[PDB]
Design an enzyme around this catalytic site. Structure first.
Site, PDB file in Angstrom:
ATOM      1  CG  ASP A   1      47.765  42.315  45.979  1.00  0.00           C
ATOM      2  OD1 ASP A   1      47.193  43.557  45.587  1.00  0.00           O
ATOM      3  OD2 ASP A   1      46.889  41.464  45.842  1.00  0.00           O
TER       4      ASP A   1
ATOM      5  CG  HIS B   1      47.680  42.418  35.444  1.00  0.00           C
ATOM      6  ND1 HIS B   1      46.236  42.781  35.306  1.00  0.00           N
ATOM      7  CD2 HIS B   1      47.607  43.046  37.121  1.00  0.00           C
ATOM      8  CE1 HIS B   1      45.658  42.980  36.164  1.00  0.00           C
ATOM      9  NE2 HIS B   1      46.198  43.034  37.396  1.00  0.00           N
TER      10      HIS B   1
HETATM   11  C1  HEM Z   1      42.552  38.065  40.720  1.00  0.00           C
HETATM   12  C2  HEM Z   1      42.669  39.377  39.981  1.00  0.00           C
HETATM   13  C3  HEM Z   1      44.136  39.940  39.765  1.00  0.00           C
HETATM   14  C4  HEM Z   1      44.807  39.825  40.439  1.00  0.00           C
HETATM   15  C5  HEM Z   1      46.134  38.403  41.448  1.00  0.00           C
HETATM   16  C6  HEM Z   1      45.924  40.789  40.193  1.00  0.00           C
HETATM   17  C7  HEM Z   1      46.929  41.263  40.981  1.00  0.00           C
HETATM   18  C8  HEM Z   1      48.264  41.999  40.098  1.00  0.00           C
HETATM   19  C9  HEM Z   1      49.572  42.506  40.418  1.00  0.00           C
HETATM   20  C10 HEM Z   1      50.491  41.083  41.247  1.00  0.00           C
HETATM   21  C11 HEM Z   1      49.844  44.005  41.194  1.00  0.00           C
HETATM   22  C12 HEM Z   1      51.786  44.096  41.170  1.00  0.00           C
HETATM   23  C13 HEM Z   1      51.690  45.057  41.947  1.00  0.00           C
HETATM   24  C14 HEM Z   1      51.086  46.142  42.326  1.00  0.00           C
HETATM   25  O1  HEM Z   1      51.439  47.530  42.178  1.00  0.00           O
HETATM   26  O2  HEM Z   1      50.082  46.188  43.472  1.00  0.00           O
HETATM   27  C15 HEM Z   1      48.796  44.347  39.471  1.00  0.00           C
HETATM   28  C16 HEM Z   1      48.922  45.399  39.157  1.00  0.00           C
HETATM   29  C17 HEM Z   1      47.566  46.304  39.103  1.00  0.00           C
HETATM   30  N1  HEM Z   1      46.241  45.511  39.167  1.00  0.00           N
HETATM   31 FE1  HEM Z   1      45.427  43.701  39.538  1.00  0.00          FE
HETATM   32  N2  HEM Z   1      45.404  41.492  40.686  1.00  0.00           N
HETATM   33  C18 HEM Z   1      43.995  41.456  39.481  1.00  0.00           C
HETATM   34  C19 HEM Z   1      43.098  42.343  38.922  1.00  0.00           C
HETATM   35  C20 HEM Z   1      42.748  44.123  38.678  1.00  0.00           C
HETATM   36  C21 HEM Z   1      41.698  43.935  38.563  1.00  0.00           C
HETATM   37  C22 HEM Z   1      39.929  43.674  37.702  1.00  0.00           C
HETATM   38  C23 HEM Z   1      42.142  45.334  38.041  1.00  0.00           C
HETATM   39  C24 HEM Z   1      41.577  46.712  37.957  1.00  0.00           C
HETATM   40  C25 HEM Z   1      40.090  46.592  37.089  1.00  0.00           C
HETATM   41  C26 HEM Z   1      43.515  45.599  38.801  1.00  0.00           C
HETATM   42  C27 HEM Z   1      44.179  46.769  38.210  1.00  0.00           C
HETATM   43  C28 HEM Z   1      45.820  46.687  38.700  1.00  0.00           C
HETATM   44  C29 HEM Z   1      46.760  48.002  38.503  1.00  0.00           C
HETATM   45  C30 HEM Z   1      45.864  49.386  38.113  1.00  0.00           C
HETATM   46  C31 HEM Z   1      47.937  48.279  38.967  1.00  0.00           C
HETATM   47  C32 HEM Z   1      49.023  48.109  38.899  1.00  0.00           C
HETATM   48  C33 HEM Z   1      49.759  48.502  37.280  1.00  0.00           C
HETATM   49  C34 HEM Z   1      50.462  50.036  37.780  1.00  0.00           C
HETATM   50  O3  HEM Z   1      50.231  50.869  37.487  1.00  0.00           O
HETATM   51  O4  HEM Z   1      52.252  49.099  38.008  1.00  0.00           O
HETATM   52  N3  HEM Z   1      44.081  43.950  38.946  1.00  0.00           N
HETATM   53  N4  HEM Z   1      47.679  43.173  39.905  1.00  0.00           N
END
Ligand code: HEM
Ligand code: HEM
Lengths: 374, 374
Positions: free
Chosen positions: A187, A283
Site C-alpha cells: 500500500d 482498482h
Molecule cells: C479500502 C479501500 C482501498 C484499498 C484497500 C486500496 C488499496 C490500494 C492498493 C493496494 C494500491 C496499489 C499500491 C499503491 O500504489 O498504493 C492502490 C492504489 C491506488 N489507490 Fe487505492 N485503495 C482503496 C481505496 C482508494 C480510494 C478511495 C482512492 C481514491 C478515491 C484510492 C486511490 C488510489 C490511487 C490513486 C492509487 C494509485 C494508482 C496508480 O497511480 O497506480 N484508493 N490502492
C-alpha cells in the site's frame, strides 16, 4: 537496526510544511479527531469566532511544547523517547460558516459530492476542526491526545475520532519497504516521491488569486474516508482472484504484467487473447491518473480496527487519508471513477465516514488559521 | 539498543508454561477475545462438546504454526519480524457446563462474586472460551487475530473483545523500567519476580486432590476486569493529591515514605502527627498482601482506549489481568478489600467488564483442554 529505531527514538521535524504530519516518514500510529464548536459558543458569529481563536491558539501553543519536549512529566508518556510525535491542525468549511467567514472559503474547500457507493453515517462525517496526531508509540500518542483534548473542552466537543496503525519500524525486516494494509496488499507504491517536484505539485494549494483566500497559500487539503473492509468475504478469494481485483501482485506488489514493485502499470498492455493485462475493473486501472485526466493525490493512510458492531460483523478497514492542492483535481474525480466505473474493490469495501479539511501552512509566531480567524 | 529491538525482532518462547502469555517480557500489544459456543451447536451436551473439541484443536494447531513461523504470507504481517507473537487459550466455567463437564470444574473456577462497586455490563462479562493474543507489533497482532477468529467461525461467536497497549520497547529510554498506565502511574512494582519461587507459588494452581480436577495441574487462573478510568476527574487533582490516592510517588514510584521505586511500603510507619505515612485508604495499602491475609496475584495488564461513548465521556482505562493459582487467595479477597474498605482509587475507576478463565498447561502433542474435553 538504526532505521528500526529511528522513528521511535527521534522527534518529528517540527518545521515540516505546511505543518507536521504530511512529509517525512509516517509514524506507526495516528489518532484522527474531528471537533465541532460547542453549542454554547454559537450565540452569534462573534462568539463562535472568539471560541475558534481560543482553541486554535491553545492547540498551537501546546503543539509547540509537544514537538519540542514531548508530553509532560506526570503523563502516560513519562520515560519515553519522542517517538516522532507530530500534531496537525485542520479547518472545516463548516467552521468558516460558523464564524462568519464564508467569503474566505476557497473553491477547493467546497463540500465533497455524494458518490454512488456512499454508505456514510452522518455522525462520522465532517467537523469544524481537525487534529491529526501521530507518533511511533501508542503511549506517547495517548498522552499527547489527552492533553490536546483537555485544551479544547470549554470551546469544542469531539464529533468523531478514530485511531489507526501501521506496522512499527522496529518490526520491519526491511525498514524501507512499503507498508501493507489489512487485506495484505502492498500500500503506497504509486505515491509521488517526497524529494520530487511532482510531490509539491500534487499536495500544495495553488496560489490564490483572491486575497481573501490567500490564507491557504502553501497549505494542503486533506480528504479522510473511513472505509470498512469486508475481510470475511476477502478471505474467500484465492490469491489470483485477489490480484485480479487490485491489478498488482500480493507477494511482490508488481503490476500483473511486471516483475518488480516499481515496474510501471502498463494500461495498454494486452495478453495473448487480446484482453488487458490489467483488468478493465482493476482498482489500479481506475485510480490511475491516466484514467482521470491527470488527477493525482498523496495517500498517507492507516489501518483501523473497531472490533465488532452489534450485528456481529467486523468493523475494521482503511483510514484513508489523501492530500492534494485541490480535491477537484485529486480525490473527487478519482473517487467518481471508482464508484461509477465499477472498481472490483467496491465489492469488498464500504465508505462509512468522510471529511474534508483545509490544512494551512505554519507561520513564525502564528497559529494555524490565525490570519483567517483574526 | 539491543533491548529496544529484542521484543519486536524475536519470537516468543513457545515452551513457556502453562502456555505462552504469562511469563517472559510482556509484549506491547494485546488482543483479548471472549467467545461463546455458537447457539447452533447447543442441541445437547454432546454437540457442544464436539464443537469445543473442534475449535480448541484448531486454535492449538494454528497457534503452533504462528509461534513457529508467524502469520502466513499474504497476510497483513508479511515482511515483518516475529514480534514476540504469543497465543494463550483459556476455558470458562460456562464451557464446562455447556459440554456436560460440571463435575470437572475445580473449586477455583467458581464464579466471581459480586462486589459493592461493580458497574458491570453483562455483554462485557464472562465467556465460554478465551484467546489472549500478544505481540510487539500491531500488524503482527492483527494478522494473527484474524486467522484465529476465522478458525472459530462455525463453532463460536465473539462475545466481547478488547485491544490493549503498553509502551513499545523501542520507545523506552530505559527498557528495563516499569511501565506506566494512563493515569501516569508506575504500574507493576510489587509483582513477584519471575525468577523467584514466590512467582510459581502465586500463579500456579495447587495440585488437585480430585483426579477429575487434575486437568488444571500446572495451570493458572486469569481474572480480567475492564476498568474505566475517570481521567477528566483525575486531571483535576494536583500531584500530591494523586500520590495520596495511590500511596506511591508519581515521579519515582517510591512509597510516600521512601526514596526509590523498590523501597518497601511500610504500612506501620507514622508521620510526625502520629498518622500513617501511607494513607488509610491508599490503594497500595488496601491491595497489599499484608492487608489481605497474604492474598497475592501476578498483574499483567494493558491500557485500553475505546474513544467516546454516546454520552460523551471518554471510554479508556485499564485492561486489568491478574494471574493466580486460586482466585479465592488472589483477586477475590483483595477486590473485596478495595470495594468495601474505601479505596481512594474507587473515586476514579469503574469496573465495567469481568471474566474468569482457567488456563491449563500445555502438553506435548495435545491441545489445551484436550484431557478435559476428550
Ligand atoms: C479500502 C479501500 C482501498 C484499498 C484497500 C486500496 C488499496 C490500494 C492498493 C493496494 C494500491 C496499489 C499500491 C499503491 O500504489 O498504493 C492502490 C492504489 C491506488 N489507490 Fe487505492 N485503495 C482503496 C481505496 C482508494 C480510494 C478511495 C482512492 C481514491 C478515491 C484510492 C486511490 C488510489 C490511487 C490513486 C492509487 C494509485 C494508482 C496508480 O497511480 O497506480 N484508493 N490502492
Ligand atoms: C484502574 C484501576 C487500577 C489502577 C490504576 C491501579 C494502579 C496501581 C498502581 C499504580 C500500583 C502501584 C505499583 C504496583 O505495585 O503495581 C498498584 C498496586 C497494586 N494493585 Fe492496583 N490498580 C488498579 C486496580 C487494581 C485492582 C482491581 C486490583 C485487585 C483486585 C489491584 C491490585 C493491586 C495490587 C495487589 C497491588 C500491589 C500492592 C502491593 O503489594 O504493594 N489493583 N495498583
Amino acid at each position: 537496526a538504526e532505521e528500526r529505531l529511528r522513528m521511535a527514538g527521534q522527534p518529528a521535524d517540527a518545521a515540516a510544511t505546511p505543518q507536521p504530519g504530511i512529509t517525512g516518514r509516517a509514524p506507526a500510529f495516528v489518532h484522527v479527531l474531528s471537533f465541532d464548536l460547542a453549542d454554547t459558543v454559537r450565540e452569534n458569529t462573534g462568539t463562535a469566532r472568539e471560541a475558534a481563536a481560543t482553541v486554535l491558539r491553545s492547540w498551537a501553543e501546546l503543539a509547540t511544547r509537544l514537538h519540542e519536549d514531548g508530553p509532560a512529566e506526570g503523563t502516560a508518556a513519562t520515560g519515553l523517547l519522542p517517538a516522532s510525535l507530530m500534531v496537525t491542525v485542520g479547518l472545516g468549511g463548516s467552521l468558516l460558516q460558523a464564524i462568519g467567514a464564508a467569503d474566505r472559503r476557497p473553491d477547493a474547500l467546497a463540500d465533497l459530492p455524494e458518490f454512488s457507493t456512499d454508505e456514510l453515517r452522518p455522525r462520522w462525517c465532517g467537523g469544524d476542526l481537525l487534529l491529526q496526531i501521530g507518533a511511533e508509540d501508542p503511549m506517547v500518542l495517548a498522552a499527547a491526545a489527552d492533553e490536546l483534548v483537555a485544551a479544547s473542552t470549554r470551546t469544542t466537543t469531539v464529533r468523531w475520532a478514530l485511531r489507526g496503525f501501521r506496522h512499527t519500524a522496529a518490526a520491519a525486516r526491511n525498514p524501507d519497504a512499503t507498508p501493507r494494509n489489512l487485506m495484505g496488499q502492498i500500500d503506497g507504491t504509486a505515491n509521488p516521491a517526497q524529494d520530487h517536484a511532482l510531490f509539491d505539485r500534487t499536495v500544495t494549494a495553488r496560489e490564490a488569486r483572491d486575497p481573501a483566500h490567500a490564507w491557504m497559500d502553501g497549505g494542503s487539503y486533506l480528504v479522510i474516508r473511513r472505509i470498512r473492509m469486508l475481510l470475511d468475504e476477502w478471505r474467500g478469494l484465492d490469491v489470483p482472484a485477489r490480484e485480479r481485483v487490485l491489478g498488482r501482485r500480493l507477494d511482490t506488489g508488481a503490476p500483473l504484467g511486471g516483475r518488480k514493485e516499481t515496474d510501471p502499470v502498463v494500461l495498454t498492455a494486452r495478453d495473448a487473447s487480446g484482453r488487458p493485462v490489467i483488468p478493465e475493473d482493476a482498482h489500479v486501472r481506475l485510480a490511475n491518473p491516466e484514467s482521470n485526466l491527470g488527477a493525482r493525490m498523496f495517500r498517507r493512510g492507516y489501518s483501523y480496527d473497531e472490533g465488532w458492531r452489534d450485528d456481529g460483523v467486523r468493523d475494521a478497514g482503511l483510514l484513508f487519508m489523501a492530500w492534494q492542492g485541490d480535491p477537484a483535481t485529486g480525490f473527487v474525480p478519482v473517487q467518481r471513477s471508482l464508484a461509477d466505473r465499477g472498481d472490483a474493490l467496491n465489492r469488498y469495501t464500504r465508505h462509512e465516514g468522510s471529511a474534508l479539511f483545509a490544512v494551512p501552512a505554519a507561520a513564525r509566531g502564528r497559529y494555524p488559521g490565525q490570519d483567517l480567524v483574526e
